[PDB]
Amino acid sequence: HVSRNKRGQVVGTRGGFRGCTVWLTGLSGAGKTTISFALEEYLVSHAIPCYSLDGDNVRHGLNRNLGFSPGDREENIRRIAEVAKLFADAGLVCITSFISPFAKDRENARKIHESAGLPFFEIFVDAPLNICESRDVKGLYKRARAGEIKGFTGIDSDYEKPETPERVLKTNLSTVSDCVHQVVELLQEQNIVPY
Amino acid sequence: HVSRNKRGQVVGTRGGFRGCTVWLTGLSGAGKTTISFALEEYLVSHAIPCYSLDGDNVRHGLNRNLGFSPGDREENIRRIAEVAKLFADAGLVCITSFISPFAKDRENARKIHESAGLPFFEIFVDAPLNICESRDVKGLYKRARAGEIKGFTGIDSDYEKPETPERVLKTNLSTVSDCVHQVVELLQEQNIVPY
Ligand SMILES: Nc1ncnc2c1ncn2[C@@H]1O[C@H](COP(=O)(O)OP(=O)(O)O)[C@@H](O)[C@H]1O
Ligand SMILES: Nc1ncnc2c1ncn2[C@@H]1O[C@H](COP(=O)(O)OP(=O)(O)O)[C@@H](O)[C@H]1O
Ligand SMILES: Nc1ncnc2c1ncn2[C@@H]1O[C@H](COP(=O)(O)OS(=O)(=O)O)[C@@H](O)C1O
Ligand SMILES: Nc1ncnc2c1ncn2[C@@H]1O[C@H](COP(=O)(O)OS(=O)(=O)O)[C@@H](O)[C@H]1O
């Protein structure tokens, strides 16, 4: 195939190979989707080609045959990681917004990127469970409490807090714009995004 | 998310939204890999960001848990189609080089692109089986004849020749450059590649 260095010439304007994955992780309703969109607008506004993977374009498409059992969440996250690696390798900034509950799966995603020489930035989107449940963006928390959903992350299945993420976004203690700026700063420090 | 039309400005220096999938189909050794590489080179050399999906980057990753039974080749091609659609939606020209033996799965790939308003070009890379077997690029035909591979398309499983492909490339009757030109011409007529 054509090399990353050639792809760096034609992907976008700025030149340079800037493929990587921004990997958002955290509780349902903690803010992954919001941050991923606002990051995406920042990136396009600054002429860095990017793409957002989330449940909307993954879960009822590539992964529509997956549910929420531990084996299925692990396949979900495995397939996502492989596809993300393909977008990073194509030279885009790939932003993922899956709860991705289990440390093991996140570290496997990272390993698949590192083996391929692609930067992987794990971003802990950290809000308290009670705050996520009070946001109840989609009404899942109220259904899970009522027993209509089981295996629901945060209530009757575990979220394993990232021990060593590249950034922690405290979404109950700061604005969307501050959270984005924290990630952008990281991409600046890694020459992915111009100052 | 950010709109297709905004993302189209930012993916490359040629303006305009050029996301689409060039879907190559045909027998092992018919010439999919060769055409896809030369097409990728044409696009990158003309400053159009593109990406190639093939067995090398899909089958031992995303689709590493899939084999060659008819159901597995059908799941293989479905997942492939969904990811291709994701690259088209990001604004890249996505080139796939899977044998993809079954018409039903190919037409499902098309439908998944068309439903999303993304161009899908099915490209029949057509050489006679005997010619493919004489090329035996990777030694698959000699292994299949010896019974070490089963279900090997063309020998003990069917290839269903495309009835309405957008182009037919007779790779035994013309050069790589003529065949590529047939595809490039199609992309010009489809406003994917400027005149
Ligand atoms: N700093 C912040 N980051 C992300 N979301 C925030 C923040 N502050 C408030 N919110 C609100 O919390 C909700 C986050 O939900 P969502 O982004 O759908 O979460 P997730 O994708 O992790 O399920 C949104 O309604 C958003 O407006
Ligand atoms: N017009 C043509 N188009 C494509 N390949 C050709 C052509 N003429 C000769 N070939 C040769 O045919 C072989 C096809 O191998 P490959 O492209 O790997 O097939 P596939 O990807 O379909 O398995 C290559 O060695 C290539 O050089
Ligand atoms: N039994 C088989 N039939 C066809 N291809 C096989 C078989 N076993 C292994 N392969 C291989 O299939 C790879 C391509 O398969 P695709 O993944 O292109 O097949 S498809 O039928 O699911 O679209 C070849 O590179 C290759 O060697
Ligand atoms: N049982 C559940 N556990 C966690 N999330 C669920 C569950 N059921 C539905 N969902 C949800 O489905 C989406 C979460 O999907 P993912 O982010 O893909 O989860 S993950 O664990 O496999 O990484 C959210 O809409 C969401 O709250």
UniProtKB/Swiss-Prot annotation, chains A, B:
Tissue-by-tissue expression: Expressed in cartilage and adrenal gland.
Effect of E160K: No effect on 3'-phosphoadenosine 5'-phosphosulfate biosynthetic process
Binding-site residues for ATP 1, renumbered to this chain: G29, A30, G31, K32, T33, T34, S174
Mutagenesis or variant effect for C20Y: In BCYM4; reduced 3'-phosphoadenosine 5'-phosphosulfate biosynthetic process
Intrachain S-S bonds: none
Binding, adenosine 5'-phosphosulfate: D56, N57, V58, R59, F68, R73, E74, E75, N76, I99, S100, K138, G151, F152
Signal peptide as annotated in the record: none
UniProt-annotated stretches for the region Adenylyl-sulfate kinase: 1-192
Family: In the N-terminal section; belongs to the APS kinase family.
Disorder noted: Brachyolmia type 4 with mild epiphyseal and metaphyseal changes: A form of brachyolmia, a clinically and genetically heterogeneous skeletal dysplasia primarily affecting the spine and characterized by a short trunk, short stature, and platyspondyly. BCYM4 is an autosomal recessive form with mild epiphyseal and metaphyseal changes. Clinical features include short stature evidenced at birth, short and bowed lower limbs, mild brachydactyly, kyphoscoliosis, abnormal gait, enlarged knee joints.
Function: Bifunctional enzyme with both ATP sulfurylase and APS kinase activity, which mediates two steps in the sulfate activation pathway. The first step is the transfer of a sulfate group to ATP to yield adenosine 5'-phosphosulfate (APS), and the second step is the transfer of a phosphate group from ATP to APS yielding 3'-phosphoadenylylsulfate/PAPS, the activated sulfate donor used by sulfotransferases. In mammals, PAPS is the sole source of sulfate while APS appears to only be an intermediate in the sulfate-activation pathway.
Protein name, UniProt field: Bifunctional 3'-phosphoadenosine 5'-phosphosulfate synthase 2
The species this protein was found in: Homo sapiens
